[PDB]
Chain length 259, copies 5
C-alpha cells in the first residue's frame, strides 16, 4: 500500500459517533452490565468458569460511506465512559462498609481499553492457568499448553464477534495491529478505586509518526472496548464485575492509496 | 449559526462571578451541605432512596447584559471548591479513628464536576440498578428497562432545575453538548482521600479547536457543578454525603453571528 | 495604572524568612503540636478549645522605603522546613504493631502558601455552623446553617497570627487580586506526608499581564499553613503536627500612576 | 570508536521483533510463569532459597544482518507486557477477598525492567542479606561479605545466560553500560496494585545526548527484561511470584564507525 | 566572584563517578545497611535513641584535577539508587503478610535525598521533640529549646562528616546553599511502598537560571545523600530502617572567575 494525498473539500470528511455496551456476562434479565457472582475453583485443574461469569471484549464494525482507490482514514477520537455517576449508588443491596454504614462502592480490579482500526483488532491469547476449561459460547485459546501461561504463538485470533472473546484470555497482539491504534490499562489490585474522567474537550490523534491513521478496508471502521470498572459486593459478600458503556466519536477523511 | 468576528473596545467584555452551592439532600434545618444517612436496600428491586439521601446536580442560569446579532461568548474559566479546610473539623460527632483517637475525616466516594455553557447542560441517564424507585421531587430516567443499566437512549434530559436531577442517574450526554464545556472526575473507592487544590493562578480556556467558546442563547450563561467530597461518618457509624460550594469566574466577549 | 519596571542595581531586593506553624501549642514543651483531639457528642455541643485548633500563619515584612514606585513581587522559592523530623518514630508513639516502631505523622493535611501586597482576604465556611469557637480565635460571626456551604457575610483579612483557625477560613476567590495563593487539602485518614525539598524550583508570581503583587505601604504579606498530619501517642490520642515554611521572594521596583 | 555518518537508502534499516518469556522459577510442569511458593527462613543466617523460588533476569541475544566498518545502531523501541488481562482470572484456586468473595488478584511487590544494548547488560551485585545461600544452578555474587549488603565492587557480571541470574541479587551496573539503554521500576510494597499500560502508539528513543544509540558489536542485539507482576495468593494463603512476557520491537540503522 | 567564560578544548572537561553507601546505624557485624531495631520511649522527656538506631546523612568529598582563577563547574548529574531489587528478598526472617504468606517487604517511612555542591551542604536543625537526648558520636542541634521543634536559627551546621549527622535532626538550609543543588522527598506514611526507578538515560542539569553550576572551591566536589527506603519487619515484629547506596556521575567543565 502506497499512501498518497488526502482529499479535501466539504465531501472529504465524515464522522462516526456511537456507544459500545459492555459485555460482562448478564447472568439474568435484571443484571445487564454485571457478571455472575464469582465462584473460585478448588484447584487449577478444576477451573471451569461459566460463560455468564466471564467479561468479554466489545466490538462494533461500522460501515462507512462506500468509496470505490480511496480509503477512509481515521484521524481523531473522542471517547469516555458513559454513566460514571451510576457508581454512586451505594444504597442498593450492597455490603455495608461497617455496622450502620453506607454500601460499598464498585472497586478493585479494573481494565479499561479501547481501539480504533481499519480492520478487526488482532488478538494474542495468554492464560493465567492453561488448564482452565472455558465455556461453550466463548472463543478461547485452543490446544493450550503450559507455555500458554506465558506465550504460545498458536493463540492468534480476530476480535470479530461480540459476547465471545473473554477479556482474561486475550490481549491485543503487539506483533500485528499495524492498522489499529489501541490503548489499555489494567489496574489490577484488590482495593483500587475507580478513577473515571469525563470531558468533551479531550481528543486523541490516531495518526502514526508518518501522519497516517488507520485505513478502513472495505469501508469498515472497527471499534473495540472493555470497561470493567471493578466489582460490586452485595450484602452476602458475593462479588460481581460491573461494566459501563464507552462513547466513541471518530473523525475520518478520504485518503488516496495505490496497489 | 455562522460565527463571525469578535467585537473589541471597552464595552465588548464582561465577567460573571458566583458560587454554586451544593445540593446534597439537606435532611434537616441544621444539615445544609450534608445528605441523609445512607440506608441500604435488601434487594435491587426494593431500592427506594429518599429524596434527602440523593445528591443532585447544581445549576445556575445567569442573565447577561442584554444584546440586540451579537452573542456573549464564554472564553475563560477560573474555578475552585470553596471551604476545603472545613473538612479539618475532626472533632464534631465523628466516629473515632481508634480508641482515644481523633474523629474520622470526610473520605471515600467523590464526584467533582463543572460545566460552562450557553444553554442547559444536556444529560443522558444511566442507572446502577434499573429497578431503583426514585422519589417524588426528583427528575429521573422514565420507562427504565434493564438496558438502562448500560445505555438506553430514551433517557435524555436538560439540567434545567436545581435540587432535582440526582447525580447517580445522570451524566453529561457526550452525543450533544456542542455549546457547553464539561469536566468531571469520579473517584469511586471506599477509602479515597479528598485531594482538593485551590489557587487564583489557574485558568481554563473554553474555546474549542476552532477558537469558539460557548455562545449564550438569550443572553444566559449556564453554570453547573457537583462536588460530592466523600462521606462523613458519625459516632454511630452512620454515613452521609458531604458537599461544598464551587466558585466560578467566567470572562465573556461579544461575538457577531449570522 | 501599572507602568514600567525600574532597572539598575538599586532596583531589586529580596525577602527571605521562615513562617512558623501555629498548631495550638498546648504546653511549654509542645510548640508545633496541637492539643490532643477530643470529639463532641453532637454537632450542637462541638466546642473546641483554642489549643486544639491550628491557625493560619502570617508575616508582614517591611521592604526598603520608597517615595509612585511600588515593590512588585516577581518570584517565589518555598518549601517546608524540617521534613526529616517526621522520621522520629521512637518518641512516645503508638507502635505499628507488637514490638514495632512508632507510627509516623500521617492523615489529614493542608499545605498552603500565599504572597501578596496586602493581607490575604478570607471567606468563612464551617463544617458545622453550631460549633462554638473559642475565645482568642477570630471566626465567622452570626453563623447560620447557610454558613455550612456559603454565607457571604463571613469576610475577613488574615491580619493577626495565631488567631484565624484553619478549619473556618479559606482564601476568598472573589477578592485577592493583589495576592497569589496556592493550597492543597489531602483530607484522608491514612494519607502519607509527601514533602519535596529543593533549592532549584521557582514559582513565578506574575499574572497574565506580567504584573506581580504590588506592595502597598512597602509591606509584603506572606501567609502559610502546613498541617502535616497527626501524631499518635502511645495512648492512641492524636494531635496535629505542623512545620515551618521557608519563603524567598524576589521583588523589583515598578512605577504606577 | 569514532562514530561517523548514518547510512541512508532503503537497505539501511532493519527491525527486530520478539518476545522474552519470564523466568519466575517454574516449580512444576504446570506452573510456567509462576515461582515456587514463598517460604521464610528463621534467621538471616539460614536463608537458603530454592532455585525454583527465585525469579531471574530474561535475556535474548538476537543476531542481526551481517555487515562487514558499519555497525547496526539501535534507534527506537516499542515495548509492553504481554497478557495483562490474564490477571483478571480471579476464579482459579485463589484465596477469597472475604467470605463468599471473589479470588484475590495478583498484587504486591513488582519489578518491571527492560534494556536494549549492543552487548550484554552489565550487572552489579547487591544483597539484601549477605549470608543468603544462593542455590546450585544460579549465578550469584561470590565471596559475599557484609559490605555486599550496600556495595561491594567485586560483584560484577554480564547478563549472558537465561534462568541463571536471580533478580534479587543483581541490578544494572550504573558505572558501566555505556552501550546499553536500561529502564526499571521497583514498586516494593505489600499491597501495591499492578498498573500495566498497553498501547502500540508509544515509542522510546534510544539515542543518547549526542544522537547515538547502542552500537551492536558482532552484529548482535541484546534484549533483557524482568516483569515480576506481584504475587498470586492461593486458597491456603501461600504466595508465589507471577510474571508475564515482554514484547520488543527495535528499529535499527547502519552507522559507519572507525 | 565574577563568573566569566567557560574554557574549551580536550582538557576542559572532566567526570566524577562514585557511590555513596548508606549509614543506617549498622547495629552489628552482619547488618550493614540496616539500623538497630526501633525502640519507643515512654514519654517525650525520656526519648534517648542509641546511635545505631539513627540513620545519618552520607557525604563524600571528591578531589578534582588540580587547577591554577579557573574552577571546576558542575554541569550535569546522573544518579540512582543501587540495589533496588534486593528489596525482593521476602524470604529472610521477615514477618509474614498473613498466615502462610510471603515475608513483608521493606516499606513505610522513607527519605530519598541527594545534593551536588562546590562546598559542604549547609544544614538547618529541626527537631521532632526538643527534649530528645541525642547519643554520643552524633552531631546534633545544641542548646535545643521548645522553639527547635519549629525553627531555631541557632541550629546551623555543615555536612562535613560521614556517619555523624542524624537524618531526623537536620535538613538542607534553604537560606544558604547558594553553591549547592539539593533535591529530596520525604514520603512519610506507615504503609508507603518504595517506588524506585532506575535508568541510565536521565540527566539532571545543575546550572542555575543564569547558566552557572556549583563552583568547586579548592578543587573539591561535595556529594551528599540519604536513601532510607523504609523499614524491614522481622518475624518478631521488630522494625529497622533499611538503606541503599546511591550512584553519582557528575560532568564538570573549567570556568574562569575574577
Amino acid at each position: 500500500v502506497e499512501v498518497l494525498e488526502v482529499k479535501t473539500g466539504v465531501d472529504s470528511i465524515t464522522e462516526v459517533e456511537c456507544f459500545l455496551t459492555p459485555e460482562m456476562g448478564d447472568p439474568d434479565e435484571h443484571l445487564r452490565g454485571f457478571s455472575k457472582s464469582i465462584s473460585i475453583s478448588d484447584t487449577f485443574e478444576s477451573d471451569s468458569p461459566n460463560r455468564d461469569m466471564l467479561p468479554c471484549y466489545s466490538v462494533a464494525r461500522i460501515p462507512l460511506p462506500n468509496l470505490n482507490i480511496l480509503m477512509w482514514e481515521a484521524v481523531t477520537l473522542k471517547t469516555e465512559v458513559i454513566g460514571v455517576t451510576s457508581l454512586m449508588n451505594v444504597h442498593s443491596n450492597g455490603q455495608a462498609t461497617h455496622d450502620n454504614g453506607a454500601g460499598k462502592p464498585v472497586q478493585g480490579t479494573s481494565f479499561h481499553f479501547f481501539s480504533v482500526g481499519g480492520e478487526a483488532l488482532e488478538l494474542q491469547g495468554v492464560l493465567f492457568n492453561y488448564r482452565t476449561k472455558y465455556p461453550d459460547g466463548t472463543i478461547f485459546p485452543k490446544n493450550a499448553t503450559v507455555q500458554s501461561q506465558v506465550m504460545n504463538t498458536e493463540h492468534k485470533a480476530y476480535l470479530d464477534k461480540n459476547k465471545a472473546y473473554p477479556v482474561e484470555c486475550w490481549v491485543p497482539d503487539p506483533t500485528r495491529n499495524e492498522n489499529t491504534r489501541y490503548f489499555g490499562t489494567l489496574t489490577g489490585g484488590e482495593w483500587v478505586p475507580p478513577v473515571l474522567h469525563i470531558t468533551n474537550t479531550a481528543t486523541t490523534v490516531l495518526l502514526d509518526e508518518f501522519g497516517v491513521g488507520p485505513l478502513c478496508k472495505g469501508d469498515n471502521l472497527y471499534l473495540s472496548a472493555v470497561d470493567v470498572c471493578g466489582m460490586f459486593t452485595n450484602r452476602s459478600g458475593s462479588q460481581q464485575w460491573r461494566g459501563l458503556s464507552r462513547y466513541f466519536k471518530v473523525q475520518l477523511r478520504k485518503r488516496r492509496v495505490k496497489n
